[PDB]
UniProtKB/Swiss-Prot annotation, chain A:
Region named Disordered: 1-20
Family: Belongs to the bacterial ribosomal protein bS20 family.
Keyword Ribosomal protein on entry: yes
GO terms of molecular function: small ribosomal subunit rRNA binding; structural constituent of ribosome
Organism, as annotated: Acinetobacter baumannii (strain AB0057)
Descriptive protein name: Small ribosomal subunit protein bS20
GO biological process assignments: translation
Assigned keywords, A-Z: Ribonucleoprotein, Ribosomal protein, RNA-binding, rRNA-binding
Bias (Basic residues): 6-20
InterPro entries registered for this protein in UniProt: Ribosomal_bS20, Ribosomal_bS20_sf
One Pfam family here: Ribosomal_S20p
From Swiss-Prot, chain B:
Keyword Ribonucleoprotein: yes
Entries under PROSITE patterns matching the protein: RIBOSOMAL_S4 (PS00632), S4 (PS50889)
Stretches assigned to the S4 RNA-binding domain: 97-159
Keywords assigned by UniProt, alphabetized: Ribonucleoprotein, Ribosomal protein, RNA-binding, rRNA-binding
Superkingdom: Bacteria
Name of the featured protein: Small ribosomal subunit protein uS4
Annotated segments matching region Disordered: 23-51
GO BP, sorted A to Z: ribosomal small subunit biogenesis; translation
Family classification: Belongs to the universal ribosomal protein uS4 family.
Curated annotation (Swiss-Prot), chain D:
Name listed for the protein in its UniProt record: Small ribosomal subunit protein uS17
InterPro entries: NA-bd_OB-fold, Ribosomal_uS17, Ribosomal_uS17_bact/chlr, Ribosomal_uS17_CS
GO biological process, one term: translation
UniProt superkingdom: Bacteria
Entry GO MF terms: rRNA binding; structural constituent of ribosome
Length: 86, 207, 82, 79
RNA sequence: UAACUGAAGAGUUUGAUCAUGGCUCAGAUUGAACGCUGGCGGCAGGCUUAACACAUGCAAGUCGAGCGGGGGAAGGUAGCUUGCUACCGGACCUAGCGGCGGACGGGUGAGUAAUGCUUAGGAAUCUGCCUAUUAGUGGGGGACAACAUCUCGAAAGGGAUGCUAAUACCGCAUACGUCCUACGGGAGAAAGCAGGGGAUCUUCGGACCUUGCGCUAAUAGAUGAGCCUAAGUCGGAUUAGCUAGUUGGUGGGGUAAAGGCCUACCAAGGCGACGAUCUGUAGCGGGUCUGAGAGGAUGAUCCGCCACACUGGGACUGAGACACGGCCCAGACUCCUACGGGAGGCAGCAGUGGGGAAUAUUGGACAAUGGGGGGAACCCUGAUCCAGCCAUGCCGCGUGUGUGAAGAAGGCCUUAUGGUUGUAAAGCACUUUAAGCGAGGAGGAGGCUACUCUAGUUAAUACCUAGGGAUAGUGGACGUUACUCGCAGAAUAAGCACCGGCUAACUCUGUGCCAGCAGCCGCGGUAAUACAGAGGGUGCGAGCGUUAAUCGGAUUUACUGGGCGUAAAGCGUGCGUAGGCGGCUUAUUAAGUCGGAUGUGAAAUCCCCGAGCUUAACUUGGGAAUUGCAUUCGAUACUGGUGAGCUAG
């Protein structure tokens, strides 16, 4: 059943899967570190993590790895939780 | 299809002259057996008949004179029922408006059978067209003319002689020298003979 | 995209087209948004050949619909006619 | 022009919610007799203003929980 | 002008009779099958059973104007034992990377009794290609297929190392819009390619300018999809209790988006006699058949929605799939193998086996209408169109017409003479439909190239985008097309059922309670009009009969529209719960009820008036209709709600 174009589609699918997985893992790592700082509870340390995390989220949202609505939700909620610290 | 068979058997069975013998001699002189049915058990017309029997004989009588088979007759009756007005009279108008019957009543056919063959062989023309269907219904204002090949025919000459012997109906007007005539409108019920009864047929189909 | 095109109908050997506005992904003789005229290639006697509604045509063309080539030619014919 | 339905409160146990029984009268499709019909609808009342026995009016809204999509408007008749 | 005009009964219980009551028959219809028979054309239909298993071929490709390599045919210059060699660049082609498509189009009805469908509404959402508008497209870098080398295996396809371009990927710069914001501020993009001309002019075949196709951020439209509420939608009580994320709230998580969608805690809720839970069966609507109507039966072919793709569980990529001809895992099955290893899913069109009473070609073309790609040329398309087969249905046509008895011959009957086949046949005259042979010949083709003009680009009458006119060229599978005109001659062409009553049409012979016929009453023991043949008839007709199935007759489930003393049928009798119904007067409300307006009720189908088909079927233009649903404004006699009064219950 397979044809040349179908096989080509499958190979491209594999490559894209690996690339997108790496970038999305980067996003999650930064968000997790920001949450860890919030748990630590120091206002300055938490805001520094927030500043260092926001650009990566914006970049991958622009690339389309995640949706811009999800990026905005993350930024809003993280900023609120950082502000509640102090 | 068509019914090809003896005509006088059917005429005697119906009990009345159907006018399928061109009338050159009297029908009585030709058949010399009227009032007696053709068969071993043929009995006089005075024998009693059932209600369904009379209802059936009426339809058979009309069908035999007008040369129409059962399927087309039933379609005609349903069409008359759909059409507004008296269904029985509409049915007779539909039968009268046939191209071959109109050719007969206009006077270029010795018999309705002969008119059927003329139409089938394209010796007749509706307006300027060489039609070849006898079931065509002729609308008001139509012009039944003869074809050039049909003209100069001994059979046609004899047919117009017989037509001159006969009386042309009022609604048709045909010039025999030009071999063409025209149709005004559907002949009225009063013009149609009173021998035929249509109510029996209407009840037959209603049952 | 939204298109204006001809949907087939009638009988064999004698097609009769409805001019319809539809989404291009729908089947030729299936779902449509609006019917705005007809086209009879073999009209004879009193039969009318082309009837196109210019108001709706202009409205849909303004809303971004793309006519097919045959419908564009017929629209030109109707523009010349009227 | 929100759709509005008037009924009477029948429950108040839940937090920030009320249950109202709504009744309609329609003719029978085959026999024509006027017959009673009723439905129970869950509503949202943030301040717990309504209680059991009162007549209330409710309107349609976006879902607030799995079963609640209607909101209180006014207490027509206090119990 | 119109859009409806419609209702029939018969047979059988008894020595008679009336009623009750079941059975049987006359009608319409079918995706039908079988039996006998069989000429033509037009329009439609054609595996209802095994969602059984599948040989073989075909059904998703296109772009070199995104990119680097590679290949063969030609051309030119210089040298030559025999027209050739050695090198050069131009056109052409494509295995690979990349873009778009592949999620449409096509098939089926297994599952699904509500996660679905129909009708009417709503707010919390995303949306490639298309249309309109706004602000841009700056400058760098690392991979990596191809390719080269080495290897495994018979091959199919695998493994290792060294290269490499880009509209493949990633950083930096900038930000009208855009996102977060504690309102102070912070954050995030993109890619080039083609052509023309200034005749400027080369950090080299360059740099500058316009145009076009592209690319990035954003708003709106359109389209498509996701989500929510109300009413409606099959049988069973010999199925009465069911539910612990269960019902609700708070913090957090998660989604494009509301939400127990997920989670920790808190509370004990939530559903059910207006049928919860359980169980059986089933895709649903527009429609279709039947019927005077109410109603009943039904979901082939046409259209909308849903679900599914050998069985089950998953995600990936992408605007969009949890994807019929994509990927992974498990199961069953099948195939190749050189035993090291591999491959597959017709409920896509043909076709094969099996099943069954039963349903067709392993055909042609992209010419027409659509779909994918492309700037175009053009390529792909079992969608589609066209052809083949089948009386399967409907409609039309033919199988000759006129003649002519001194009533021929023959068969059959007979009260042995006469009657019936019978104007029938023979003989006479005559035309030629359809088919058969020969020549012409429309339309489905709109259009495109060639010449030359008007408007726009703005440095540029160049290039390119829109309009026009006649010609020349050009393009059709069906197609020896429809259709028209010539010649021969009645020459090529009719069967099936039935004849006691229902029910139109009766006799002889052979045979006898045997053979047999039979829908019901019935017929058959030597004078059967009911059995077999024959004559004559009757009803249909390229058809005629039987079987199977639904509605009707059936007022035998009775809403329209039935019954319970003796025919079937009042519980052995009370009391009472839910429910149904409820006296008189008055004021108020406007739920029931009634009236008006707006929106909606897709198209096709039904009916009415027209048009094109030689007619009819059929196709088609408009109207009516869709008898409903929702919103809103009005009326208050009756029913219901509320307040008050009264006495005949």
């Amino acid at each position: 059943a397979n044809s040349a174009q179908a096989k080509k589609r499958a190979r491209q699918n594999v490559k894209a899967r690996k690339h997108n997985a790496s970038l999305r893992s980067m996003v999650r790592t930064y968000i997790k570190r920001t949450l860890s700082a919030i748990a630590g509870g120091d206002y300055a340390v938490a805001t520094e993590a927030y500043k260092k995390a926001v650009p990566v989220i914006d970049r991958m949202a622009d690339k389309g790895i995640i949706h811009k609505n999800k990026a905005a939700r993350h930024k809003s909620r993280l900023n609120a939780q950082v502000k509640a610290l102090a | 299809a068509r019914y090809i068979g003896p005509k006088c058997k059917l005429s005697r069975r119906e009990g009345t002259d159907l006018q399928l013998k061109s009338g050159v001699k009297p029908f009585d002189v030709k058949t010399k057996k009227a009032n007696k049915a053709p068969g071993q058990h043929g009995q006089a017309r005075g024998g009693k008949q059932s209600e369904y029997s009379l209802q059936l004989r009426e339809k058979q009588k009309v069908r035999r004179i007008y040369g129409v088979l059962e399927r087309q007759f039933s379609n005609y009756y349903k069409e008359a029922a759909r059409v507004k007005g008296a269904t029985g009279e509409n049915l007779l108008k539909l039968l009268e408006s046939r191209l071959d019957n109109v050719v007969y009543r206009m006077g270029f056919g010795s018999t309705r059978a002969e008119a059927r063959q003329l139409v089938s062989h394209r010796s007749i023309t509706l307006n300027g067209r060489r039609v070849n269907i006898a079931s065509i219904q002729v609308k008001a204002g139509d012009v039944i003319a003869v074809h050039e090949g049909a003209k100069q025919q001994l059979r046609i000459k004899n047919a117009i002689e017989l037509a001159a012997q006969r009386g042309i109906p009022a609604w048709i007007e045909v010039d025999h020298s030009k071999l063409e005539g025209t149709f005004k409108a559907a002949p009225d019920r009063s013009d149609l003979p009173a021998e035929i009864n249509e109510s029996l047929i209407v009840e037959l189909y209603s049952k | 995209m939204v298109v204006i095109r001809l949907a087939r109908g009638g009988a064999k050997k004698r097609p009769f087209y409805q001019i319809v506005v539809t989404d291009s992904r729908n089947a030729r003789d299936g779902r449509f948004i609006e019917r705005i005229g007809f086209f009879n290639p073999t009209a004879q006697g009193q039969a009318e050949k082309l009837r196109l509604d210019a108001d709706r045509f202009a409205h849909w063309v303004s809303q971004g619909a793309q006519p097919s080539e045959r419908v564009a030619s017929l629209a030109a014919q109707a523009k010349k006619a009227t | 022009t929100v759709r509005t339905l008037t009924g009477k409160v029948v429950s108040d146990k839940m937090d920030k919610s009320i249950v109202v029984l709504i009744e309609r009268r329609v003719q029978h499709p085959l026999y024509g007799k006027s017959i009673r019909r009723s439905t129970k609808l869950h509503a949202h009342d943030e301040n717990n203003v309504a209680k059991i026995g009162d007549v209330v009016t409710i309107k349609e809204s976006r879902p607030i929980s799995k079963t609640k999509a209607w909101t209180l408007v006014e207490v027509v008749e206090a119990a």
